[PDB]
Amino acid sequence: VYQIPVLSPSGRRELAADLPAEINPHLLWEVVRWQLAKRRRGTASTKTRGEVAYSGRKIWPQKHTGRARHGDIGAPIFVGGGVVFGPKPRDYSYTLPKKVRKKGLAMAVADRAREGKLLLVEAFAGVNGKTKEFLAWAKEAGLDGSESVLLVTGNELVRRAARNLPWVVTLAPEGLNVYDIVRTERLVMDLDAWEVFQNRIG
Amino acid sequence: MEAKAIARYVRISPRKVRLVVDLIRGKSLEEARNILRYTNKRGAYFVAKVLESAAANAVNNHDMLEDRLYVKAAYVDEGPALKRVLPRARGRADIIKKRTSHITVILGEKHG
Amino acid sequence: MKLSDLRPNPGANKRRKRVGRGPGSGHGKTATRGHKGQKSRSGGLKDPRR
Amino acid sequence: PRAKTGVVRRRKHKKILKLAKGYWGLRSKSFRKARETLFAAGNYAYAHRKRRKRDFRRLWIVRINAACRQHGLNYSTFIHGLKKAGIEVDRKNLADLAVREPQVFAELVERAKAAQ
Amino acid sequence: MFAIVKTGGKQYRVEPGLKLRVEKLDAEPGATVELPVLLLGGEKTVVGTPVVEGASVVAEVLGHGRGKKILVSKFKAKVQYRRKKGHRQPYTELLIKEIRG
RNA sequence: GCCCCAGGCGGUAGGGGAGCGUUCCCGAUGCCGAUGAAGGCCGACCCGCGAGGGCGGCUGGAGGUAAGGGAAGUGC
RNA sequence: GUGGAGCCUGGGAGUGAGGGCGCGAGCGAUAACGUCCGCGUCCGAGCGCGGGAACAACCGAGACCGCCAGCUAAGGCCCCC
RNA sequence: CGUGAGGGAAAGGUGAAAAGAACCCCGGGAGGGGAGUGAAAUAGAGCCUGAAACCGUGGGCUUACAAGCAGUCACGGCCCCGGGGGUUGUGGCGUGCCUAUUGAAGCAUGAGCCGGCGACUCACGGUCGUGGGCGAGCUUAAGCCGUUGAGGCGGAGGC
């Protein structure tokens, strides 16, 4: 359905290609919320009135002191006292449904693809592990740098030779995710990563 | 021109010395000098030193005619109170505020 | 479609019902708990089901 | 994340206080007393909006009643006349005529007793 | 020559060359309007009954404004009832062009 | 059919809806910023119904951060 | 009889100290700003508005807002007003 | 602080650089004024900014026959900015706020004022609704594999 450009020394081939023809933006929204959620450290800690380092001794008697009634200074109402309902060690991860993750991933790829910002690649004959290699390639490959592009492939000589690029986002094919696909204007993949993509939406 | 001297951090009640300083506001310099010299008030001394000091500043530093000098405007800001404890009856303690005062004198050459 | 275009469906997400934030919210001074009573106290009632 | 009060509380207090400029004593200095006095000033503003109309109507009936009594008839008689006389001019413009147009208002009384 | 007219359920004494705010009329700025004249006050002091028969004033609208923000703020006591409410009553600023007999 | 038609609009407990603002994540290797950020003081100026927002003036001297979403130690 | 009417199905409630007034009763002393009920109303929650001088429930009347417009309600029209 | 076991504080910030103010003057000194350093010194060490409470100092209005929950409406006067802003002399109206109450202006409770902290959450289950996915199917946990912010596998198990 989505005829995909394929750069190579043999010119520009294409693919058909099968993708979800319709984009459901709410779904990609939910999936991105998933990825961002589950990668939170959740290290926000506090100290309740039992966790705080004070004592349990009543500061002054209940009655006849004139002062207002209080228990321990560690209570949440004293400056220095513990916090009520403060954040605790909390896991924000959660299992988003697999059909939803896979489906939404395919829908992101359909977004950048059907919007022309997808570019599979057959090979990286230019790049050989040095950055300027990948630069002169990419400009040679029809790229300026204004398009933050998601580069996906299994060639560590390529990814390693293009990490330092600010406008390039490195990924091996396994790390393909909806979030990074939305982060980038244009998307680029190797045909092998194309295959693992297909198998990942099998 | 206006000269000015300031007794910054004068250990004395501000409210007390304000009564003194409010007695020489708008006076000629000689007048205020004499009035200070014979006013039965502890603050009158500090007002005196600040007064003459302001005269020296008006003469040497700002170079004003000492004859036309008068107290154009003076006042007493309050300073950092020194908190001390007064042991009161039955164990309880008070906290007296040994108040410090800032004195400001401001001199002009009255004309005519 | 970039990230700023990602929005949940209208109503897919929803605010909470924050209480004790004054009279303007209408949920103020009581957190809906009404006036005095065992149910209004912190911790609340016993098992209402039983 | 913690969200301390920061700047919100201070800005709100300064809002209320700028509303409270010109109030006696702490009512223009303390945010609390300022708030309270602003409540009373709000209800007063409302009720006195609803009041001022009745008030000026009272003034209008007063002045009109005087000017009409300078021509023999009283307020109720004049009103009854103009009402019968098929005239719709209201208490405000009647008053302003009686103070400004003794001859025009005089003509109004003319049609007024003319109503009888 | 003045005259009392009516607009927005109100009665205004007016004279030519006068800027007069009224209710928010429906008329483009620069447009002109003839008005119901309650009474012609002047030499031929004719009394509109209830309106002057052939007379009516002409006034080109100067433009629609919004009154100063009246801050209507109700408050009940001991009930947690506070109602702050901005407000700006629109108006039609006018100029008395003339008074047609 | 954004506008017109009719009707309604006191309000506690309470139920519901709709927004404002605070800290922090994405936007952001971005953008604003010494020609001055945040912050403070001031405005009779503009926006909003309001929560508030701009904008302006002075202080301040170095951070701030959009649209659009998310998460709360969120409004005294 | 189209009404912020009705019914059903679900979620969330609060309320479960009421009070005054009228009427019909009990108790009481045919006393109580009393108590206890029924019918109703108002307040509660309408200490928003006019009158009753002042006054929650008595009389009028249900406060979306603005207007330096008009007509009335109870109540008033000798001055305050 | 407590015999003691034990309780338990407050308290950060100049400046890029001390360049930390020589020296003069007043002063017993302190402190101050000059000078000087400095981008800046109301950045001067009691030091980033510096709010409010509070305190005073100058100016504008106003006030000594006068009644008041402090306001609000009108009018007038004055002053200021150029139609507005400040003050209120008069007249009208007007029983603080919160809670708790049938009922509070209440002579019921709380609060001296200001500034800051301060209270409906989280987890895991259930139930209702809802936004989406799939649908007589739905769906994974532990763990495994990967990056080291990348996810996938994992059907055990549950409904």
mmCIF file of N, CA, C and O (backbone and C1' of nucleotides) in Angstrom, chain B residues 4-9 18 22 25 45 49 52-53 56-57 60-62 74-76 78 80, chain H residues 21 24-35 42 44-47 54-58:
data_model
loop_
_atom_site.group_PDB
_atom_site.id
_atom_site.type_symbol
_atom_site.label_atom_id
_atom_site.label_comp_id
_atom_site.label_asym_id
_atom_site.label_seq_id
_atom_site.Cartn_x
_atom_site.Cartn_y
_atom_site.Cartn_z
ATOM 1 N N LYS B 4 25.210 64.509 55.404
ATOM 2 C CA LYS B 4 24.537 63.484 56.178
ATOM 3 C C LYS B 4 25.557 62.631 56.903
ATOM 4 O O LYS B 4 26.569 62.232 56.327
ATOM 5 N N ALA B 5 25.278 62.371 58.170
ATOM 6 C CA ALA B 5 26.012 61.402 58.958
ATOM 7 C C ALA B 5 25.004 60.494 59.636
ATOM 8 O O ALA B 5 23.863 60.889 59.896
ATOM 9 N N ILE B 6 25.429 59.265 59.905
ATOM 10 C CA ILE B 6 24.538 58.226 60.390
ATOM 11 C C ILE B 6 25.246 57.446 61.481
ATOM 12 O O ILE B 6 26.280 56.819 61.231
ATOM 13 N N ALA B 7 24.691 57.480 62.687
ATOM 14 C CA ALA B 7 25.123 56.587 63.751
ATOM 15 C C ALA B 7 24.465 55.238 63.508
ATOM 16 O O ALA B 7 23.359 54.947 63.972
ATOM 17 N N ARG B 8 25.149 54.412 62.733
ATOM 18 C CA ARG B 8 24.644 53.086 62.440
ATOM 19 C C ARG B 8 24.949 52.174 63.617
ATOM 20 O O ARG B 8 26.068 52.172 64.135
ATOM 21 N N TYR B 9 23.951 51.406 64.046
ATOM 22 C CA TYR B 9 24.097 50.468 65.154
ATOM 23 C C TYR B 9 24.440 51.188 66.455
ATOM 24 O O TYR B 9 25.488 50.970 67.060
ATOM 25 N N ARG B 18 14.192 58.898 69.365
ATOM 26 C CA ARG B 18 13.345 59.607 68.417
ATOM 27 C C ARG B 18 12.784 60.873 69.035
ATOM 28 O O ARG B 18 12.668 61.900 68.359
ATOM 29 N N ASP B 22 13.592 64.390 67.199
ATOM 30 C CA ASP B 22 12.455 65.178 66.755
ATOM 31 C C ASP B 22 12.449 66.579 67.345
ATOM 32 O O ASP B 22 11.559 67.370 67.021
ATOM 33 N N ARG B 25 14.772 68.958 64.517
ATOM 34 C CA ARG B 25 14.425 68.899 63.109
ATOM 35 C C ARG B 25 14.018 70.287 62.641
ATOM 36 O O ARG B 25 13.112 70.900 63.213
ATOM 37 N N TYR B 45 23.093 62.724 73.607
ATOM 38 C CA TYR B 45 24.522 62.624 73.356
ATOM 39 C C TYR B 45 24.798 62.079 71.966
ATOM 40 O O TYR B 45 25.553 62.678 71.190
ATOM 41 N N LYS B 49 26.804 63.701 68.754
ATOM 42 C CA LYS B 49 27.952 63.241 67.982
ATOM 43 C C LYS B 49 27.609 63.126 66.507
ATOM 44 O O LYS B 49 28.398 63.524 65.643
ATOM 45 N N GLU B 52 27.421 66.938 65.118
ATOM 46 C CA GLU B 52 28.709 67.548 64.816
ATOM 47 C C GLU B 52 29.411 66.808 63.691
ATOM 48 O O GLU B 52 30.036 67.431 62.825
ATOM 49 N N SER B 53 29.315 65.479 63.686
ATOM 50 C CA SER B 53 29.909 64.702 62.607
ATOM 51 C C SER B 53 29.327 65.107 61.264
ATOM 52 O O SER B 53 30.058 65.278 60.282
ATOM 53 N N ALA B 56 30.972 68.258 60.212
ATOM 54 C CA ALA B 56 32.281 68.045 59.609
ATOM 55 C C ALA B 56 32.148 67.544 58.183
ATOM 56 O O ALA B 56 32.867 67.998 57.286
ATOM 57 N N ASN B 57 31.227 66.611 57.952
ATOM 58 C CA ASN B 57 31.032 66.094 56.606
ATOM 59 C C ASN B 57 30.563 67.190 55.666
ATOM 60 O O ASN B 57 31.027 67.284 54.525
ATOM 61 N N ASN B 60 34.027 69.561 55.379
ATOM 62 C CA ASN B 60 35.172 68.993 54.685
ATOM 63 C C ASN B 60 34.739 68.297 53.407
ATOM 64 O O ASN B 60 35.126 68.697 52.305
ATOM 65 N N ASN B 61 33.912 67.262 53.537
ATOM 66 C CA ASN B 61 33.598 66.433 52.384
ATOM 67 C C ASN B 61 32.794 67.209 51.353
ATOM 68 O O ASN B 61 33.268 67.461 50.241
ATOM 69 N N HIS B 62 31.593 67.635 51.713
ATOM 70 C CA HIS B 62 30.736 68.254 50.718
ATOM 71 C C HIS B 62 30.990 69.743 50.562
ATOM 72 O O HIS B 62 30.486 70.338 49.606
ATOM 73 N N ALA B 74 16.301 64.798 59.916
ATOM 74 C CA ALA B 74 16.952 63.745 60.671
ATOM 75 C C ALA B 74 15.886 62.801 61.193
ATOM 76 O O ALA B 74 14.705 63.143 61.263
ATOM 77 N N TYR B 75 16.319 61.606 61.566
ATOM 78 C CA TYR B 75 15.392 60.555 61.954
ATOM 79 C C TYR B 75 16.196 59.388 62.491
ATOM 80 O O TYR B 75 17.427 59.399 62.478
ATOM 81 N N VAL B 76 15.483 58.374 62.963
ATOM 82 C CA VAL B 76 16.092 57.243 63.644
ATOM 83 C C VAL B 76 15.429 55.975 63.134
ATOM 84 O O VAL B 76 14.338 55.614 63.584
ATOM 85 N N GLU B 78 15.268 51.901 63.105
ATOM 86 C CA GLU B 78 15.523 50.924 64.147
ATOM 87 C C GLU B 78 16.520 49.896 63.643
ATOM 88 O O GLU B 78 16.526 49.550 62.461
ATOM 89 N N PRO B 80 19.084 46.214 64.448
ATOM 90 C CA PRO B 80 18.914 44.826 64.885
ATOM 91 C C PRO B 80 18.825 44.711 66.391
ATOM 92 O O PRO B 80 19.813 44.927 67.097
ATOM 93 P P A H 21 39.759 46.408 53.524
ATOM 94 O "O5'" A H 21 39.876 47.976 53.317
ATOM 95 C "C5'" A H 21 40.865 48.513 52.459
ATOM 96 C "C4'" A H 21 40.288 49.611 51.618
ATOM 97 C "C3'" A H 21 39.736 50.790 52.394
ATOM 98 O "O3'" A H 21 40.736 51.729 52.728
ATOM 99 C "C1'" A H 21 38.126 50.060 50.849
ATOM 100 P P C H 24 45.387 59.610 57.233
ATOM 101 O "O5'" C H 24 44.422 60.714 56.625
ATOM 102 C "C5'" C H 24 44.942 61.790 55.861
ATOM 103 C "C4'" C H 24 43.875 62.813 55.588
ATOM 104 C "C3'" C H 24 42.931 63.076 56.745
ATOM 105 O "O3'" C H 24 43.457 63.982 57.693
ATOM 106 C "C1'" C H 24 41.670 62.671 54.813
ATOM 107 P P C H 25 43.006 63.876 59.230
ATOM 108 O "O5'" C H 25 41.533 64.473 59.226
ATOM 109 C "C5'" C H 25 41.252 65.704 58.579
ATOM 110 C "C4'" C H 25 39.771 65.875 58.381
ATOM 111 C "C3'" C H 25 38.919 65.589 59.602
ATOM 112 O "O3'" C H 25 38.846 66.688 60.487
ATOM 113 C "C1'" C H 25 38.033 64.438 57.755
ATOM 114 P P C H 26 38.922 66.440 62.068
ATOM 115 O "O5'" C H 26 37.494 65.846 62.421
ATOM 116 C "C5'" C H 26 36.322 66.588 62.143
ATOM 117 C "C4'" C H 26 35.107 65.888 62.682
ATOM 118 C "C3'" C H 26 35.308 65.137 63.980
ATOM 119 O "O3'" C H 26 35.265 65.986 65.108
ATOM 120 C "C1'" C H 26 34.133 63.776 62.458
ATOM 121 P P G H 27 36.130 65.625 66.408
ATOM 122 O "O5'" G H 27 35.628 64.171 66.801
ATOM 123 C "C5'" G H 27 34.309 63.982 67.275
ATOM 124 C "C4'" G H 27 33.983 62.524 67.447
ATOM 125 C "C3'" G H 27 34.971 61.699 68.244
ATOM 126 O "O3'" G H 27 34.874 61.885 69.641
ATOM 127 C "C1'" G H 27 34.399 60.529 66.302
ATOM 128 P P G H 28 36.213 62.111 70.495
ATOM 129 O "O5'" G H 28 37.078 60.809 70.199
ATOM 130 C "C5'" G H 28 38.411 60.699 70.671
ATOM 131 C "C4'" G H 28 38.649 59.358 71.306
ATOM 132 C "C3'" G H 28 38.219 58.161 70.478
ATOM 133 O "O3'" G H 28 39.199 57.768 69.537
ATOM 134 C "C1'" G H 28 37.350 57.954 72.649
ATOM 135 P P G H 29 38.877 57.849 67.969
ATOM 136 O "O5'" G H 29 38.194 56.449 67.643
ATOM 137 C "C5'" G H 29 38.918 55.238 67.787
ATOM 138 C "C4'" G H 29 38.093 54.192 68.485
ATOM 139 C "C3'" G H 29 36.985 53.557 67.660
ATOM 140 O "O3'" G H 29 37.448 52.498 66.845
ATOM 141 C "C1'" G H 29 36.129 54.218 69.754
ATOM 142 P P A H 30 36.958 52.377 65.322
ATOM 143 O "O5'" A H 30 35.418 51.996 65.434
ATOM 144 C "C5'" A H 30 35.011 50.690 65.810
ATOM 145 C "C4'" A H 30 33.578 50.685 66.269
ATOM 146 C "C3'" A H 30 32.546 50.998 65.197
ATOM 147 O "O3'" A H 30 32.157 49.848 64.470
ATOM 148 C "C1'" A H 30 32.167 52.377 67.065
ATOM 149 P P G H 31 32.414 49.760 62.890
ATOM 150 O "O5'" G H 31 31.350 50.763 62.273
ATOM 151 C "C5'" G H 31 29.988 50.686 62.647
ATOM 152 C "C4'" G H 31 29.358 52.050 62.652
ATOM 153 C "C3'" G H 31 29.515 52.853 61.376
ATOM 154 O "O3'" G H 31 28.606 52.486 60.357
ATOM 155 C "C1'" G H 31 30.083 54.208 63.197
ATOM 156 P P G H 32 28.933 52.881 58.838
ATOM 157 O "O5'" G H 32 29.012 54.462 58.869
ATOM 158 C "C5'" G H 32 27.852 55.225 59.143
ATOM 159 C "C4'" G H 32 28.112 56.686 58.933
ATOM 160 C "C3'" G H 32 28.683 57.059 57.581
ATOM 161 O "O3'" G H 32 27.686 57.153 56.588
ATOM 162 C "C1'" G H 32 29.920 58.119 59.274
ATOM 163 P P G H 33 28.082 57.022 55.044
ATOM 164 O "O5'" G H 33 28.755 58.418 54.722
ATOM 165 C "C5'" G H 33 28.078 59.622 55.022
ATOM 166 C "C4'" G H 33 28.989 60.794 54.818
ATOM 167 C "C3'" G H 33 29.718 60.801 53.492
ATOM 168 O "O3'" G H 33 28.925 61.348 52.459
ATOM 169 C "C1'" G H 33 31.245 61.220 55.243
ATOM 170 P P G H 34 29.246 60.991 50.935
ATOM 171 O "O5'" G H 34 30.570 61.816 50.638
ATOM 172 C "C5'" G H 34 31.600 61.267 49.838
ATOM 173 C "C4'" G H 34 32.895 62.006 50.035
ATOM 174 C "C3'" G H 34 34.028 61.596 49.116
ATOM 175 O "O3'" G H 34 33.942 62.210 47.848
ATOM 176 C "C1'" G H 34 34.816 61.677 51.329
ATOM 177 P P A H 35 33.957 61.307 46.528
ATOM 178 O "O5'" A H 35 35.448 60.762 46.469
ATOM 179 C "C5'" A H 35 36.544 61.648 46.626
ATOM 180 C "C4'" A H 35 37.817 60.890 46.879
ATOM 181 C "C3'" A H 35 38.011 59.646 46.037
ATOM 182 O "O3'" A H 35 38.507 59.930 44.747
ATOM 183 C "C1'" A H 35 38.462 59.137 48.284
ATOM 184 P P U H 42 25.652 51.929 48.011
ATOM 185 O "O5'" U H 42 24.566 50.923 47.438
ATOM 186 C "C5'" U H 42 24.519 49.581 47.890
ATOM 187 C "C4'" U H 42 23.127 49.201 48.310
ATOM 188 C "C3'" U H 42 22.094 49.152 47.198
ATOM 189 O "O3'" U H 42 22.110 47.923 46.497
ATOM 190 C "C1'" U H 42 21.235 50.378 49.025
ATOM 191 P P G H 44 26.408 46.371 50.007
ATOM 192 O "O5'" G H 44 27.929 46.107 50.365
ATOM 193 C "C5'" G H 44 28.327 44.863 50.916
ATOM 194 C "C4'" G H 44 29.349 45.055 52.002
ATOM 195 C "C3'" G H 44 28.977 46.092 53.054
ATOM 196 O "O3'" G H 44 29.550 45.704 54.296
ATOM 197 C "C1'" G H 44 30.976 46.727 52.016
ATOM 198 P P A H 45 28.635 45.602 55.604
ATOM 199 O "O5'" A H 45 28.876 44.120 56.120
ATOM 200 C "C5'" A H 45 28.445 43.009 55.357
ATOM 201 C "C4'" A H 45 29.518 41.958 55.295
ATOM 202 C "C3'" A H 45 30.337 41.797 56.559
ATOM 203 O "O3'" A H 45 29.688 40.975 57.505
ATOM 204 C "C1'" A H 45 31.765 41.856 54.673
ATOM 205 P P G H 46 29.751 41.344 59.063
ATOM 206 O "O5'" G H 46 28.245 41.195 59.550
ATOM 207 C "C5'" G H 46 27.486 40.029 59.249
ATOM 208 C "C4'" G H 46 26.018 40.354 59.170
ATOM 209 C "C3'" G H 46 25.616 41.141 57.930
ATOM 210 O "O3'" G H 46 24.253 40.875 57.613
ATOM 211 C "C1'" G H 46 25.304 42.485 59.851
ATOM 212 P P C H 47 23.880 40.010 56.314
ATOM 213 O "O5'" C H 47 24.557 40.792 55.103
ATOM 214 C "C5'" C H 47 24.599 40.224 53.801
ATOM 215 C "C4'" C H 47 25.299 41.134 52.823
ATOM 216 C "C3'" C H 47 25.432 40.621 51.399
ATOM 217 O "O3'" C H 47 24.269 40.861 50.632
ATOM 218 C "C1'" C H 47 27.501 41.506 52.131
ATOM 219 P P C H 54 1.713 46.212 59.951
ATOM 220 O "O5'" C H 54 2.974 46.603 60.823
ATOM 221 C "C5'" C H 54 3.180 45.979 62.075
ATOM 222 C "C4'" C H 54 4.520 46.339 62.644
ATOM 223 C "C3'" C H 54 4.899 47.802 62.540
ATOM 224 O "O3'" C H 54 4.316 48.596 63.550
ATOM 225 C "C1'" C H 54 6.681 46.497 61.778
ATOM 226 P P C H 55 3.947 50.124 63.240
ATOM 227 O "O5'" C H 55 5.356 50.857 63.221
ATOM 228 C "C5'" C H 55 6.288 50.641 64.262
ATOM 229 C "C4'" C H 55 7.680 51.040 63.857
ATOM 230 C "C3'" C H 55 7.858 52.468 63.393
ATOM 231 O "O3'" C H 55 7.919 53.375 64.471
ATOM 232 C "C1'" C H 55 9.034 51.014 61.958
ATOM 233 P P G H 56 6.687 54.356 64.763
ATOM 234 O "O5'" G H 56 7.319 55.800 64.586
ATOM 235 C "C5'" G H 56 7.341 56.421 63.314
ATOM 236 C "C4'" G H 56 8.746 56.620 62.810
ATOM 237 C "C3'" G H 56 8.922 57.795 61.866
ATOM 238 O "O3'" G H 56 9.153 58.993 62.574
ATOM 239 C "C1'" G H 56 9.909 55.865 60.920
ATOM 240 P P U H 57 8.421 60.342 62.132
ATOM 241 O "O5'" U H 57 9.231 60.788 60.845
ATOM 242 C "C5'" U H 57 10.647 60.789 60.856
ATOM 243 C "C4'" U H 57 11.174 61.288 59.544
ATOM 244 C "C3'" U H 57 10.224 62.194 58.793
ATOM 245 O "O3'" U H 57 10.264 63.522 59.261
ATOM 246 C "C1'" U H 57 11.018 60.539 57.332
ATOM 247 P P G H 58 9.185 64.577 58.738
ATOM 248 O "O5'" G H 58 9.792 65.055 57.354
ATOM 249 C "C5'" G H 58 9.133 66.043 56.589
ATOM 250 C "C4'" G H 58 9.323 65.802 55.120
ATOM 251 C "C3'" G H 58 8.078 65.967 54.277
ATOM 252 O "O3'" G H 58 7.818 67.318 53.969
ATOM 253 C "C1'" G H 58 9.129 63.944 53.714
#
